[PDB]
Design a protein around this ligand. Structure first.
Ligand code: NI
Length: 341
């Protein structure tokens, strides 16, 4: 049974609700982004209308085989009427194709559902500037002040400099980057660009990247692993055993691996600067964990919410324990008292 924070009152609509069977009264199912916790349930057998971005629609069709007749892609930044209700999709600054959804209810209430997002000041100059929001359904993944991490641009600067230095000292080093979902593509794309290489990967991952509308993608990626000195591997293989096993397969072309594991936040963020990050090393293999986040920091979240001034906030993450829910409610009340709304 579908929880309350996935229903949109006063409409026939749900958000990210595909794992509960047929939801009573749902005439349109919105999908914010192609991450498995959110799409859990969709397949070729789905026969209700799905509303989403163009990129999410390409993934639904090619990766999950949803039939074309049930896929309803909408452009971004454009007022659209769905089942007699005005909606807008906005870029969420999460993974490719990820959106926030603004719903203009028949009674006059305006609701914003963030999906998963990484808040940014550029959002203060979208179509959100123009009017009031009564209800915010908020991605609270990192809603506590201990969650700190750098900008994505600082993290990419560290990875490019680290890779370029290593392969210039040793032309026979291979670079490996872990993946398990869409998102964070700038990590392997930026590194391959500085090294003058295409990125090598499996047929399955190539297919997924081909759905993403990335400009000049055919110039950037390949399934021919031998021609490439940046390889992608599933995240589970990013360990000393998995990497040794991979280097054997490369036919004595390489004598060293440098690997990157993009993570979310980790508690080494509470002491160390990005500059001071060091790898784990065994022999000719070194592994860097780098804190490249596609969710808001505490400070980014607080700025967004204090600017938007919603009348009510409904969290969508960390909602399963009394202590988590209580902690989030405390911060929402500080923010409101500090800013005066
Ligand atoms: Ni996500």
């Amino acid at each position: 049974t579908c929880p309350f924070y996935k229903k949109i009152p006063g409409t026939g609509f749900t958000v990210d609700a595909f794992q509960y069977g047929v939801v009573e009264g749902c005439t349109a199912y919105f999908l914010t982004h192609f991450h498995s916790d959110h799409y859990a349930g969709l397949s070729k057998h789905f026969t209700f209308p799905v509303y989403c971005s163009e990129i999410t629609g390409n993934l639904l069709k090619n990766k999950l085989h949803v039939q074309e007749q049930y896929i309803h892609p909408l452009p971004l930044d454009t007022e659209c009427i769905v089942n007699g209700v005005k909606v807008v999709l906005l870029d969420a600054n999460h993974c490719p194709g990820a959106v926030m959804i603004l719903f203009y209810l028949p009674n006059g209430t305006v609701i914003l559902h963030t999906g998963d997002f990484r808040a940014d000041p550029s959002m203060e100059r979208s179509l959100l500037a123009d009017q009031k929001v009564h209800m915010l359904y908020l991605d609270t993944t990192y809603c506590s002040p201990e969650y700190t991490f750098p900008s994505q641009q600082e993290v990419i600067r560290f990875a490019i400099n680290t890779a370029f230095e290593a392969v210039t000292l040793n032309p026979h080093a291979l670079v490996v980057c872990g993946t398990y979902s869409i998102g964070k593509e700038k990590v392997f794309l930026a590194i391959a660009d500085v090294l003058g290489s295409k990125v090598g990967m499996s047929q399955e991952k190539y297919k997924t990247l081909q759905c993403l509308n990335i400009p000049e993608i055919n110039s950037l990626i390949t399934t021919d692993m031998c021609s490439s000195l940046v390889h992608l591997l599933p995240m589970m293989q990013i360990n000393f055993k998995g990497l040794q096993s991979h280097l054997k397969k490369c036919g004595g072309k390489y004598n060293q691996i440098l690997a990157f594991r993009p993570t979310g936040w980790t508690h080494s963020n509470k002491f160390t600067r990005i500059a001071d990050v060091i790898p784990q090393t065994k022999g000719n293999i070194s592994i860097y964990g780098i804190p490249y986040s596609e969710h808001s920091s505490y400070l980014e979240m607080k700025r967004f919410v204090q600017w938007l001034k919603p009348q009510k906030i409904i969290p969508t993450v960390n909602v399963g324990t009394w202590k988590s829910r209580s902690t989030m409610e405390k911060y929402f009340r500080e923010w409101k008292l500090e800013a005066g709304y």
